[PDB]
Amino acid sequence: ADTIVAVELDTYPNTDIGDPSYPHIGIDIKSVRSKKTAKWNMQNGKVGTAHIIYNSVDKRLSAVVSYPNADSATVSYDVDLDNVLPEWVRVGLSASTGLYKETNTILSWSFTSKLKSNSTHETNALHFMFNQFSKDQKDLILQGDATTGTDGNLELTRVSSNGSPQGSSVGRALFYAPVHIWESSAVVASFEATFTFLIKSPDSHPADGIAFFISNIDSSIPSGSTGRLLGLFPDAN
Amino acid sequence: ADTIVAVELDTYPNTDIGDPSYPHIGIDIKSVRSKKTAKWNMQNGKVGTAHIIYNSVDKRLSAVVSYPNADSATVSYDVDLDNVLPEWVRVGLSASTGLYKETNTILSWSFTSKLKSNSTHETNALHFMFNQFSKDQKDLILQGDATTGTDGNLELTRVSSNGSPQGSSVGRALFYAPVHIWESSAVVASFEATFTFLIKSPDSHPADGIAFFISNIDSSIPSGSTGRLLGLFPDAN
Amino acid sequence: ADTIVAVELDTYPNTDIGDPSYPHIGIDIKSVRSKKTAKWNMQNGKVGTAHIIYNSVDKRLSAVVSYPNADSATVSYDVDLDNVLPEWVRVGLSASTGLYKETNTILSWSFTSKLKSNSTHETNALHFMFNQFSKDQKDLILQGDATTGTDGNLELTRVSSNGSPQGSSVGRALFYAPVHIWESSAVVASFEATFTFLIKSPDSHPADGIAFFISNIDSSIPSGSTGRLLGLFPDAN
Amino acid sequence: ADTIVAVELDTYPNTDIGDPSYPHIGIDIKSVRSKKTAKWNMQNGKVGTAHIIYNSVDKRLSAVVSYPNADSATVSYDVDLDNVLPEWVRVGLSASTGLYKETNTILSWSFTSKLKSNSTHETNALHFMFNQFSKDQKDLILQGDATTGTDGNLELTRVSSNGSPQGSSVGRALFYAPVHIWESSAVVASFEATFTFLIKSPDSHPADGIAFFISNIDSSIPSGSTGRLLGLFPDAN
Numbered sequence: 001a002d003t004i005v006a007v008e009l010d011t012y013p014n015t016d017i018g019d020p021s022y023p024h025i026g027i028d029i030k031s032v033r034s035k036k037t038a039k040w041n042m043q044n045g046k047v048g049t050a051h052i053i054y055n056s057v058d059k060r061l062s063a064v065v066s067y068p069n070a071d072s073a074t075v076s077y078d079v080d081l082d083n084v085l086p087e088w089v090r091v092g093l094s095a096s097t098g099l100y101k102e103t104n105t106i107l108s109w110s111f112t113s114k115l116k117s118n119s120t121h122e123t124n125a126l127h128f129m130f131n132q133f134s135k136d137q138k139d140l141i142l143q144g145d146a147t148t149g150t151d152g153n154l155e156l157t158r159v160s161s162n163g164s165p166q167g168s169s170v171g172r173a174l175f176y177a178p179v180h181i182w183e184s185s186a187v188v189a190s191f192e193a194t195f196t197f198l199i200k201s202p203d204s205h206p207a208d209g210i211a212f213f214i215s216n217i218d219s220s221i222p223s224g225s226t227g228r229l230l231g232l233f234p235d236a237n
Numbered sequence: 238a239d240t241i242v243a244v245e246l247d248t249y250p251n252t253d254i255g256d257p258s259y260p261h262i263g264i265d266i267k268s269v270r271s272k273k274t275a276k277w278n279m280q281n282g283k284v285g286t287a288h289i290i291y292n293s294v295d296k297r298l299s300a301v302v303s304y305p306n307a308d309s310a311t312v313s314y315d316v317d318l319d320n321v322l323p324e325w326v327r328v329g330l331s332a333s334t335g336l337y338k339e340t341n342t343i344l345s346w347s348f349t350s351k352l353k354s355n356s357t358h359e360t361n362a363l364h365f366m367f368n369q370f371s372k373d374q375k376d377l378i379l380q381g382d383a384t385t386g387t388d389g390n391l392e393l394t395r396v397s398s399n400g401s402p403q404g405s406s407v408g409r410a411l412f413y414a415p416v417h418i419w420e421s422s423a424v425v426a427s428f429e430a431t432f433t434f435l436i437k438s439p440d441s442h443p444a445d446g447i448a449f450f451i452s453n454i455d456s457s458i459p460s461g462s463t464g465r466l467l468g469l470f471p472d473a474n
Numbered sequence: 475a476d477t478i479v480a481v482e483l484d485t486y487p488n489t490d491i492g493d494p495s496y497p498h499i500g501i502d503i504k505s506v507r508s509k510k511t512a513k514w515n516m517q518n519g520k521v522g523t524a525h526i527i528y529n530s531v532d533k534r535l536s537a538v539v540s541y542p543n544a545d546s547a548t549v550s551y552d553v554d555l556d557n558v559l560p561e562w563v564r565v566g567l568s569a570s571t572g573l574y575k576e577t578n579t580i581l582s583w584s585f586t587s588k589l590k591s592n593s594t595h596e597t598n599a600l601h602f603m604f605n606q607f608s609k610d611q612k613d614l615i616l617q618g619d620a621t622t623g624t625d626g627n628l629e630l631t632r633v634s635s636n637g638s639p640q641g642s643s644v645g646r647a648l649f650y651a652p653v654h655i656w657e658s659s660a661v662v663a664s665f666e667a668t669f670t671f672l673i674k675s676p677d678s679h680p681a682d683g684i685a686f687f688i689s690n691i692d693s694s695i696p697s698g699s700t701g702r703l704l705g706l707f708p709d710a711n
Numbered sequence: 712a713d714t715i716v717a718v719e720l721d722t723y724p725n726t727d728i729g730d731p732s733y734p735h736i737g738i739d740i741k742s743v744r745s746k747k748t749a750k751w752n753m754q755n756g757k758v759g760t761a762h763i764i765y766n767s768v769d770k771r772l773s774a775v776v777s778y779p780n781a782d783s784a785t786v787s788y789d790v791d792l793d794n795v796l797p798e799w800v801r802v803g804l805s806a807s808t809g810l811y812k813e814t815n816t817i818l819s820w821s822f823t824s825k826l827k828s829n830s831t832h833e834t835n836a837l838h839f840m841f842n843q844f845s846k847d848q849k850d851l852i853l854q855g856d857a858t859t860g861t862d863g864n865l866e867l868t869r870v871s872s873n874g875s876p877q878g879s880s881v882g883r884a885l886f887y888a889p890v891h892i893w894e895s896s897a898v899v900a901s902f903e904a905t906f907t908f909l910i911k912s913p914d915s916h917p918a919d920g921i922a923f924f925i926s927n928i929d930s931s932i933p934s935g936s937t938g939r940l941l942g943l944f945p946d947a948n
């Protein structure tokens with residue numbers, strides 16, 4: 001199936017499957033059962049920022065999530081992406097809701113990837129920045145319920161006409177061009193992703209969360225991955 | 238058919254269709270018959286650099302082609318791209334040979350596009366830089382005889398095993414992701430493209446040329462566009 | 475004395491000295507009497523954006539000023555900066571008030587300059603971006619009444635504790651490092667500057683304006699340059 | 712005195728003071744006796760590249776030094792720069808020779824710094840790239856024997872008219888503008904430095920080395936810091 005490396009911003013604790021008993025951010029390597037998690041003081045209705053970084057020298061995937069004037073949550077995990085992902089991948093954002101729901105609104109998203117060749121010592125680079133999403137954003141592959149243009153935002157999961165989030169929704173947005181994430185002959189390689197989001201929920205328990213992911217080029221939403229599986233995994237193994 | 242805006246580095250003068258009687262660089266707007274040209278002292282076997290710029294404030298497309306320690310050739314043309322191209326396009330490089338030939342080798346290629354919206358005054362941007370091309374360059378759509386990986390270069394037209402260029406060849410390389418080149422609510426929109434090339438020819442008259450182009454997203458090589466047509470136009474009109 | 479090239483956002487019409495009879499943007503080359511102006515529909519109390527561009531190929535200094543969802547004002551003037559400015563300069567923002575006043579608040583400021591060698595075809599570049607100004611911004615040279623840190627903004631002219639603008643004020647802010655704006659052996663040189671401002675006035679006629687400027691490295695506020703002189707010129711000649 | 716954090720490319724082993732018995736790269740925190748070192752297969756007369764990265768999330772300073780088609784040497788050290796350096800600093804390059812010598816030629820140098828505020832979540836950034844050094848490089852503070860312009864290169868240490876390196880030389884080059892390396896209210900802060908060098912020596916043992924360093928703004932070369940002190944420290948403690 002698909003190979004997924006993801007940083008999840010999990011708003012709903014699903015303890016039956018390994019989740020700690022509070023909202024949290026985690027690093028998922030081919031499984032929804034986070035290799036490492038951190039407590040996340042999610043604020044309903046506020047705009048927050050997630051920053052994801054990695055480099056081939058340190059081989060550490062790190063993420064910082066925060067809201068203005070509040071403490072940030074950080075999670076890091078040592079992982080050599082060379083052994084996990086194919087050299088060419090697609091990057092994207094995914095979100096879901098189940099019995100409980102929330103808006104999974106993306107207000108901005110940027111990504112920078114750099115590869116320095118050992119033979120050449122010159123760099124190949126890719127950078128994209130979205131601060132506005134149009135109703136016909138052709139450089140984005142929208143999967144599931146994901147839509148763009150509403151107020152210039154990216155809505156990963158279904159929201160009704162009047163602005164209310166729907167349950168049992170799943171959606172993803174992948175950047176159109178494949179990304180060369182690693183290469184055997186590379187001296188240094190690194191990527192950095194940033195996105196601002198707005199998670200808002202009418203009910204007591206918001207669910208299920210947002211995730212920045214890296215996958216094989218032809219990745220598709222596994223059937224039935226609504227809710228706990230965050231639109232990324234086919235099962236809870 | 239296709240909508241094409243291109244900057245050509247024409248090495249072969251086809252006077253029957255409007256070419257000046259010497260190698261030159263030109264700005265082509267929907268026709269191979271350049272709106273503006275400038276004399277170009279092409280140097281057989283030397284590595285050159287081409288720099289193309291445009292901004293929606295001035296509405297002027299400019300290109301500078303030069304070799305290290307030599308005079309540069311410059312050509313500019315006032316054109317409002319909103320009236321010629323669709324708002325979403327693909328960018329690429331094209332080349333061809335005919336009775337006469339030449340290698341149409343690309344050693345590097347970079348492009349940067351920016352769009353500042355009117356509703357938000359926030360910018361969307363795209364940037365890619367290739368200084369090395371691998372044998373499996375998944376973020377390039379290769380058309381015709383174009384290939385990559387040979388010495389880390391991009392060969393737009395057919396070259397034999399021993400390095401000799403072939404005639405009646407046409408090839409193009411387009412960046413995988415569509416580019417939002419303009420929008421009605423844009424305060425400013427600009428792009429910049431740079432590429433280094435190596436044109437080498439065994440015969441007295443090198444042909445036919447290399448071109449940086451912008452087209453509709455689904456653009457493909459028009460049949461019989463070898464030689465003078467540079468793999469861009471269906472006829473000489 | 476000083477050599478000044480500037481783009482003014484002139485809010486007060488001083489018809490005695492050439493100003494047209496309405497708010498306007500203009501290009502000033504060594505004199506407060508602009509070489510070219512354009513009507514500017516200034517909006518009291520709204521945040522606007524100014525974008526200034528120039529390149530050595532077209533040798534045209536262009537500027538666009540606009541407010542979200544409003545028409546933009548544009549002004550362009552052909553000028554070869556090599557003949558006017560020394561090769562090493564400082565870039566900054568200046569503002570003033572006189573009998574009438576306004577806040578001359580700068581919310582963000584970025585600048586990018588690139589010089590490309592003819593010998594090498596390689597680039598030297600400088601880029602800075604301020605989206606926040608701290609109380610002790612060591613990379614900015616503040617002159618006159620300019621201060622930083624208040625709400626993380628840069629106040630070019632005097633503003634009272636309660637937020638009310640004072641008359642007869644003048645202040646500037648220059649980036650600390652000299653900038654290599656042009657070079658004889660350069661193939662292509664270009665610069666781009668962007669700043670967001672907030673001009674708010676309690677009285678009927680706001681005055682006097684804000685200006686982006688380029689000057690010799692050791693430039694200082696000319697004595698008596700409040701009001702119509704915008705902290706840039708010693709007289710109205 | 713001064714506060715120095717440096718990455719040294721030490722070519723001469725001074726075993727009395729801690730150096731391992733071979734050329735190496737190391738991370739120095741307020742002392743010439745490196746906290747961590749790694750064997751470095753220095754190649755006399757070849758052009759190499761040094762890449763230094765740091766981010767405040769991982770709080771790890773890493774450096775990779777290599778030559779095209781050769782293995783790289785890597786060294787990392789966990790250090791929270793907030794506890795050692797002031798929030799504003801100057802960045803530079805230093806080099807020295809003693810009884811033995813070498814050319815300490817810098818061919819290129821780039822640096823990028825970014826600081827994201829907690830209060831706002833907006834980034835302040837600084838970027839400079841030098842691929843050519845001119846005879847009057849006004850944005851560099853040259854100290855000691857350092858000079859620029861020769862072939863467009865930066866010579867940190869004294870080289871005679873005929874290209875031969877001198878002994879007992881020391882020199883540094885610092886970027887003119889102070890750099891905001893950290894802040895209490897920062898969500899993320901990171902920097903990346905890259906430079907290409909050419910170490911060539913006529914004698915059997917090249918000495919003494921090159922260092923990328925970060926210091927207090929008003930740092931100057933300590934007197935007598937030739938040889939093993941690399942133009943950075945007053946003594947060997």
Ligand SMILES: CO[C@H]1O[C@H](CO[C@H]2O[C@H](CO)[C@@H](O)[C@H](O)[C@@H]2O)[C@@H](O)[C@H](O)[C@@H]1O
Nearest residue numbers: 012014097098099100101207208226227228
């Ligand atoms: C009723 O208890 C069980 O089911 C609960 C509901 O589970 C759905 O909703 C979740 C939150 O949106 C989602 O994560 C899950 O996949 C289901 O779609 C659940 O809260 C309990 O933990 C339990 O499994």
Ligand SMILES: CO[C@H]1O[C@H](CO[C@H]2O[C@H](CO)[C@@H](O)[C@H](O)[C@@H]2O)[C@@H](O)[C@H](O)[C@@H]1O
Nearest residue numbers: 249251334335336337444445463464465466
């Ligand atoms: C026989 O003369 C005519 O054809 C000549 C050859 O034309 C081919 O080769 C050209 C150069 O490679 C190319 O531009 C053209 O499209 C054909 O592929 C031509 O050189 C003469 O000018 C004339 O048209």
Ligand SMILES: CO[C@H]1O[C@H](CO[C@H]2O[C@H](CO)[C@@H](O)[C@H](O)[C@@H]2O)[C@@H](O)[C@H](O)[C@@H]1O
Nearest residue numbers: 486488571572573574575681682700701702
């Ligand atoms: C008395 O009329 C003359 O002076 C008036 C006041 O001029 C001051 O205020 C102006 C607006 O702040 C400023 O531009 C000028 O330099 C003086 O500080 C002026 O309004 C009239 O136009 C006239 O010059």
Ligand SMILES: CO[C@H]1O[C@H](CO[C@H]2O[C@H](CO)[C@@H](O)[C@H](O)[C@@H]2O)[C@@H](O)[C@H](O)[C@@H]1O
Nearest residue numbers: 723725808809810811918919937938939940
């Ligand atoms: C007498 O042997 C000792 O000193 C030698 C000379 O030391 C000078 O030169 C060194 C190499 O350039 C330099 O590192 C040092 O600071 C002095 O300037 C040295 O070569 C021997 O290894 C030994 O320490």
Ligand SMILES: [Ca+2]
Nearest residue numbers: 010012013014
């Ligand atoms: Ca969960």
Ligand SMILES: [Ca+2]
Nearest residue numbers: 247249250251
């Ligand atoms: Ca032709």
Ligand SMILES: [Ca+2]
Nearest residue numbers: 484486487488
């Ligand atoms: Ca005026």
Ligand SMILES: [Ca+2]
Nearest residue numbers: 721723724725
């Ligand atoms: Ca040593």
Ligand SMILES: [Cl-]
Nearest residue numbers: 945946947948
């Ligand atoms: Cl000593």
Ligand SMILES: [Mn+2]
Nearest residue numbers: 010019026034
């Ligand atoms: Mn989880």
Ligand SMILES: [Mn+2]
Nearest residue numbers: 247256263271
């Ligand atoms: Mn032509």
Ligand SMILES: [Mn+2]
Nearest residue numbers: 484493500508
């Ligand atoms: Mn005026």
Ligand SMILES: [Mn+2]
Nearest residue numbers: 721730737745
């Ligand atoms: Mn050492």
